[PDB]
Structure formats: C-alpha cells, structure tokens
Design a protein around this ligand. Structure first.
Ligand code: HEC
Ligand code: HEC
Ligand SMILES: [Co+2]
Lengths: 106, 106
C-alpha cells in the first residue's frame, strides 16, 4: 500500500490486539502489522520528500520500522506460546514507538 | 536503594541529560539511570504488594524495565560516539516509556 494506508492498517490492528480475547486473533493482527510496517518502510514521508535518498534522516526513518518489526516479532512469540496476557502487553509497547516516529517525521 | 529513590535517580538524571554540555556528562547520567532502573526492577511497587512475583502484573512491571534499559543502552551508544544531540534526543524519548509503566503501576 502507500504509507498512509499502512499507517491505517497499523492503527486498526493495534486495537484488534487489545480487544482480542484469544491468542489466535492476537497472532493474525501482528502478522498484518508486520507486513504493513515493512511496506511503510519503503516510503518517503512528506517532510523528507525534498531530501536525499541516502539521507541520514532517511536511514533513521527506516530504522524506526525495523525497531517496530522487532517488537512485533517479540509479541508474536508471546502469542504463539499462548501467553495471551503477555502478548497484549508486549503489543502495547509499540505505542511509544508509533508516537516517537510521528513527533519527528509526521 | 528503595524504589522511590531509584525513580528519583531516573528523574534527576533526565534533567541532567537535559542540561548537559558534553558526551561525558550525558554518559554518566545514562550510566546512573541504567543502574537505577535495573535495581528498581527487582523491587515491588505498592500497587503490587498483594500479587505474586510471577504474576502477569509483576512480569509486565519487570519487562517494562527491560525495555527501558535497552533504550538507555541505545542512548549510551550514541553518546559514546560523540553525538550529544541525538543521545539527548533519545533520552527524552524515554519519557513515554516511563509514563507507559506509570499508567499501570504508579
Ligand atoms: C516511522 C518510523 C513511523 C512509525 C514507527 C509509525 N509511523 Fe505512523 N506515520 C508516520 C508518518 C511519516 C506518518 C504521516 C504520513 C503522511 O504522509 O501523512 C504517519 C501517520 C500515521 C497516521 C495518520 C495517517 C495519515 O494519513 O495521516 C496514523 C493513524 C498512524 N501513523 C498510526 C501509527 C501507529 C499506530 C503506529 C505504531 C503502531 C505508527 N503509526 C508508527 C511514520 C511512522
Ligand atoms: C515500570 C516499568 C516503571 C518504569 C519504566 C518507570 N517507573 Fe517511575 N514509577 C514506577 C512506580 C511503581 C512508581 C511508584 C513509586 C511509588 O512508590 O509510589 C513510579 C514513580 C515514579 C516517581 C515518583 C517518585 C516518588 O517519590 O513518588 C518518579 C519521580 C519516577 N517514577 C520517575 C521515573 C522516570 C523519570 C522514569 C523513566 C525515565 C521512570 N520513572 C520509569 C514504575 C516505573
Ligand atoms: Co523499543
């Protein structure tokens, strides 16, 4: 998708996790965010369009998504083992990282 | 120390990093924060007296600290590399993580 869509596919699924009751809706939400995060990584946001392709602020921007995928992978581990309450909490650690990338590049 | 002076140790050094002038000063404050958070990790918050230390709550409280120390370590790396601007930037990103644990356990 485009960055704007991935962000929405990221946004809704965070709520799916928290209003999921079983580990199996948790796991499929995360699978989706992972793909949506890795797709948004390819993008070049508004307030860096008029800037380099090997920008340092551009590699920092793409490393935001690697860090997010890492958290997503971790919560999947908590999920796949059926540790349901743990994996919803792990997912909630994404929030700060969502916000931090906004504050700089949104 | 007790958890209240640990959180004070994290509280003051955040402003110490806010004021700081060179990489040495930022590193020393991040060093104290790391030890103040790893020690506070072993403590039990008043909101959690009547849990058992293997409860989800006390796991989420410990994990909360594991995430902070990882990001304190990221900020230590930037500071050792002489990037005082970014290490400071990475430190006040810590604050959302503090609040995220404060909104359950403070
Ligand atoms: C960078 C590494 C980011 C991370 C991690 C997250 N987001 Fe984001 N987000 C980013 C940008 C640059 C933008 C603005 C894009 C634009 O051109 O407008 C956004 C935007 C959003 C939005 C609004 C979508 C819109 O069209 O304005 C939402 C709802 C959103 N982001 C949610 C969101 C969540 C929940 C995240 C973490 C789980 C998250 N984003 C991470 C850059 C980055
Ligand atoms: C859990 C995973 C926590 C993280 C991460 C941080 N804090 Fe903390 N904080 C936590 C608890 C359980 C409490 C209650 C202390 C009490 O006994 O009531 C607090 C509170 C504080 C305080 C108040 C100290 C006081 O004497 O009342 C401060 C000043 C504070 N926290 C600072 C702080 C900072 C700056 C943090 C990250 C950078 C941080 N805390 C993380 C639990 C957790
Ligand atoms: Co993190």
């Amino acid at each position: 998708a485009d960055l704007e869509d991935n962000m929405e596919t990221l946004n809704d699924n965070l709520k799916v996790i928290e209003k999921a009751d079983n580990a199996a809706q948790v796991k499929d939400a995360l699978t989706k965010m992972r793909a949506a995060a890795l797709d948004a990584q390819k993008a070049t946001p508004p307030k860096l369009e008029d800037k380099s392709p090997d920008s340092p602020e551009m590699w920092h921007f793409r490393h935001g998504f690697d860090h997010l995928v890492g958290h997503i992978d971790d919560a999947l581990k908590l999920a796949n083992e059926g540790k349901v309450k743990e994996a919803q909490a792990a997912a909630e650690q994404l929030k700060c990282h969502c916000n931090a990338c906004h504050q700089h590049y949104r």
